[PDB]
Amino acid sequence: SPSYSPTSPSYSP
Amino acid sequence: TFVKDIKPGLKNLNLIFIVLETGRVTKTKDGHEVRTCKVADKTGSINISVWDDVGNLIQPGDIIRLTKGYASVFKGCLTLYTGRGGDLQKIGEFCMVYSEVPNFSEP
Amino acid sequence: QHIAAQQKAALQHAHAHSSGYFITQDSAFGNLILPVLPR
Amino acid sequence: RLLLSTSLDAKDELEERLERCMSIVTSMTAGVSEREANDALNAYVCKGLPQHEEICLGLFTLILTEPAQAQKCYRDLALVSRDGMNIVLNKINQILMEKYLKLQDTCRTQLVWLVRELVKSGVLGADGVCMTFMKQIAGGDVTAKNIWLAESVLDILTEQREWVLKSSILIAMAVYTYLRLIVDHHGTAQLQALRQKEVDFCISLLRERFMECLMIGRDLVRLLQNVARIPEFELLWKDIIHNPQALSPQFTGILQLLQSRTSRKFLACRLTPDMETKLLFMTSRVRFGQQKRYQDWFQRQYLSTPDSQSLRCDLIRYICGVVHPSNEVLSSDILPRWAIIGWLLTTCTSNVAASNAKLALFYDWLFFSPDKDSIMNIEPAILVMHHSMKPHPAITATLLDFMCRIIPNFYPPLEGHVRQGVFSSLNHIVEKRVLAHLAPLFDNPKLDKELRAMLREKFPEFC
Numbered sequence: 001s002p003s004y005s006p007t008s009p010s011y012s013p
Numbered sequence: 014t015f016v017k018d019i020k021p022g023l024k025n026l027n028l029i030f031i032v033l034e035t036g037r038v039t040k041t042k043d044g045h046e047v048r049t050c051k052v053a054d055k056t057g058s059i060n061i062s063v064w065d066d067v068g069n070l071i072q073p074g075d076i077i078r079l080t081k082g083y084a085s086v087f088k089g090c091l092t093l094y095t096g097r098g099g100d101l102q103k104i105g106e107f108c109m110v111y112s113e114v115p116n117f118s119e120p
Numbered sequence: 121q122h123i124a125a126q127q128k129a130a131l132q133h134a135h136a137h138s139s140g141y142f143i144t145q146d147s148a149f150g151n152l153i154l155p156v157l158p159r
Numbered sequence: 160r161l162l163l164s165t166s167l168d169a170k171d172e173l174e175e176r177l178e179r180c181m182s183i184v185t186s187m188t189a190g191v192s193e194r195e196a197n198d199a200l201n202a203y204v205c206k207g208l209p210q211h212e213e214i215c216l217g218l219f220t221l222i223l224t225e226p227a228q229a230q231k232c233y234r235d236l237a238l239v240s241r242d243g244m245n246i247v248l249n250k251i252n253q254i255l256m257e258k259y260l261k262l263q264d265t266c267r268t269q270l271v272w273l274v275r276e277l278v279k280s281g282v283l284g285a286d287g288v289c290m291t292f293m294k295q296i297a298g299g300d301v302t303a304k305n306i307w308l309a310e311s312v313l314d315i316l317t318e319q320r321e322w323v324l325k326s327s328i329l330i331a332m333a334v335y336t337y338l339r340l341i342v343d344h345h346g347t348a349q350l351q352a353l354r355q356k357e358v359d360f361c362i363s364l365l366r367e368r369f370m371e372c373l374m375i376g377r378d379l380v381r382l383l384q385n386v387a388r389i390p391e392f393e394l395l396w397k398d399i400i401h402n403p404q405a406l407s408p409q410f411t412g413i414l415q416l417l418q419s420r421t422s423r424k425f426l427a428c429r430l431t432p433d434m435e436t437k438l439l440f441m442t443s444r445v446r447f448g449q450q451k452r453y454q455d456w457f458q459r460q461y462l463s464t465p466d467s468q469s470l471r472c473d474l475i476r477y478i479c480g481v482v483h484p485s486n487e488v489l490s491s492d493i494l495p496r497w498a499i500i501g502w503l504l505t506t507c508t509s510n511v512a513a514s515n516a517k518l519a520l521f522y523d524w525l526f527f528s529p530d531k532d533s534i535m536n537i538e539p540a541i542l543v544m545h546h547s548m549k550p551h552p553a554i555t556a557t558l559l560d561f562m563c564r565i566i567p568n569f570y571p572p573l574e575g576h577v578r579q580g581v582f583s584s585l586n587h588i589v590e591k592r593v594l595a596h597l598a599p600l601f602d603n604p605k606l607d608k609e610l611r612a613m614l615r616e617k618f619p620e621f622c
Contacts, residue, residue: 013208013241033452067167073456075167103169107437110444111452137511139345140385145568148609149560153514154568157380158387158396 015056019093021084030054031109032075036063049092055112062092076104127152161223162261173254177220184217184232193231201239215240215247222273223266233276248284252291256432259295267308275315278322286326289316293336294428298343298473299466309340310353317360330371334364335425338382343466362391369407376421378476381522417526417576426480429473438477442484447494454502468512472519475503479523483535497542504543504554517561524562525569527580529587537584538593545594552605559610566617578617585621597621 014028036050048063062085063071079101085094095101127144130152134144141158162174187203188196204211218239221232236244255270262270274292277285289312296309316323316333323329337357344350344357365372372379386392398405403412427435434457441453462470478499507513523536540558547555566577588597601621602611615622 013205013211070165070167077167101167103167105169107440110446111449139342139388141387147560147564149607151560151564153510154565155384155514155518156569157384158393 016052016054016059017057019059019082019084019091023084024081026079026082029076029078029104030059030061031111032061032071032077033073033111033113035073036068036071049087051116051118053111053113053116055115058116058118060087060090060092060118062087062094074106074109076106076109077101078104161220161263161266162258163263164261171258173258177216180213180217180220183213184221193235197235197238200235204239204241211241212246212250215244216250219247219251219273223269226269229269229272233273237280243283245284248282248288252287255288256291256295260433264304271308271311271315274312278315278319281322285322286329289329290332290428293332295431296336296340296429297431297461298339298429299464299470300343301346301464301466306344306350313337313353313357313360317356320360320364323364324368327371330364330368331375332424332428334361334368334372335375335379335382336428337361338379338386339429342382342385342469358386358389358391362395365395366406369410373410373416373419374422375425376419377417377522377526378421378425380416381519417573418528420528420531421480423481426477430477434474435477438482441494441499442482442496443488443493445494446492447498450494450498450502458506462506468507468509469515471503471506471512472515475500475516475519476522478503479520479536479539483533489538495542496539497546500539500543501547501551501554504558505551513557514561517558518565520558521562521565524580524584525577527583527587529583534587534591537588541588541593544600548600548603548605556606556610559606563610563613582618582620585618589621 016028016030019028030052031054032050033052034050036048038046039048041047046065046068048065048068049060050063050068051058051060079093079095079099081098081100083094083099085092131144134142134153140155142153142155144152145154146152147154161177162171183203187199200214204214215236218232218236222229222236240247274285274288277288292312297305323333338361341354341357341361344354383392383396387396399413403410437453437457441450445453461467464470478496482496484496504513504516507516520540523532527536544555544558562581566581567574569577585597588594594600601614
């Protein structure tokens with residue numbers, strides 16, 4: 001997941 | 014879990030047995046066909062009471078376990094019984110290994 | 121000569137049953153039918 | 160309920176999952192108009208992944224329930240599926256190959272309708288569904304419903320032959336399976352017309368996709384020889400002989416086909432999962448001695464038909480080509496395969512059946528190659544010869560006579576390859592010494608004179 005920082009919100013489906 | 018430990022008065026039974034053999038048509042009293050079937054394993058052999066309804070549609074290999082059963086004797090031969098609280102339930106099929114050598118139904 | 125009658129019966133049975141190309145060839149031990157590829 | 164069963168039948172947890180799916184999909188709809196229904200449905204699907212899967216399975220079961228509801232729920236499934244229903248197709252495959260023994264006839268028809276819809280729409284992964292549904296057809300059987308199902312899926316495949324064309328491996332799977340069905344089916348005028356349709360489709364596929372048919376294996380020729388009386392196959396064979404490059408420029412000739420190998424998928428796919436699982440259980444759990452009960456059960460239940468004799472040959476091919484046990488299990492005291500081969504051979508009650516079974520056994524022996532092939536194709540054979548010398552000399556003598564006489568009879572222009580394969584197999588037995596010495600078996604005193612004489616004559620190296 002290079003487009004999202006690790007400290008960004010996770011999109012849980 | 015051995016076949017040998019089916020005693021009268023036992024509670025909370027969870028034993029596992031396989032019906033490798035088929036019951037045979039026989040006459041008892043007048044009008045009822047209370048069939049009987051025998052199975053064997055490496056521990057021992059015991060007979061199973063087979064009613065007409067189950068005995069018509071039975072095919073070998075089924076796995077069933079009883080609860081709140083009570084052992085019975087039929088003409089000197091031990092026979093399992095189900096009723097007055099007892100109930101049967103099938104689990105699986107074909108995941109067993111048998112041993113027909115220790116059978117006590119021989120002469 | 122019962123061998124002739126037996127061979128005729130064998131040919132009849134082979135033609136009735138074999139739904140593919142087949143060869144009937146005699147063998148010393150008595151074998152008569154052996155499938156192979158088309159010519 | 161949906162699946163036929165009785166009180167004594169086990170409470171199937173998969174079926175309980177299906178029932179919960181029925182509950183959620185129906186009770187959530189509540190007979191409201193489709194608009195708000197699909198709105199709420201999409202909300203529930205997008206809530207999370209397991210509920211999405213539950214909704215998908217509920218839609219799938221509704222497709223198997225009632226016609227109008229099947230139409231509406233297939234519409235809703237196509238509208239609400241997120242990932243394209245690939246894992247849903249996986250679960251469809253599992254339910255199919257597991258519960259087909261108990262599936263109701265109306266559910267079967269509606270599932271066939273769903274399969275046709277998926278194939279026509281070109282949903283990804285439909286090739287897997289097609290080939291697993293194809294695998295459930297039992298060979299050597301003449302049940303009306305099974306033949307109707309085969310005809311229906313054949314119609315589906317014929318109308319969507321282009322979808323087969325874009326699916327490379329499915330071409331080979333379909334053509335092989337339909338050849339097997341062709342050699343199985345005959346007897347009635349309807350079956351004659353069905354035969355005509357199948358042979359026309361197979362010839363069209365073989366000509367149009369000869370390069371793709373190359374990887375089927377030598378068993379393609381085995382199917383060809385049984386259906387060689389039809390002039391189409393004779394014409395195709397003559398065209399191959401005259402100019403093999405004409406039908407495909409890269410296809411140099413029959414040399415590549417003969418030197419090639421047959422993949423396990425073709426041998427495996429003709430068997431239903433139950434028989435293969437039983438054989439795996441026997442080869443993995445059953446110790447030597449108990450094999451009689453299971454095989455007799457399977458024989459009386461199924462292998463009791465006129466076509467069962469060829470089904471024995473099919474099972475022999477499946478055991479030889481697919482079943483490749485490890486050496487570690489070989490070392491153990493698990494049930495040796497020599498007993499399995501002996502039971503398979505002794506049940507051939509007609510000369511034609513025995514001939515077919517022996518040809519099936521010797522089919523791999525024609526073109527042996529040590530580097531790419533395992534010794535498992537000849538270890539049961541040599542074990543049978545060594546173990547059947549004393550108790551059953553007749554089986555050993557018959558097999559030896561057939562394998563000695565097949566060498567010049569098979570094909571004199573290629574008999575040298577047969578001798579080369581036999582020599583390679585003998586060298587493979589010598590290098591990996593399953594037996595201490597091969598000398599006593601070659602010149603066994605109780606074997607006939609001419610067999611030992613020609614064995615000495617053909618192979619002076621092993622003397």
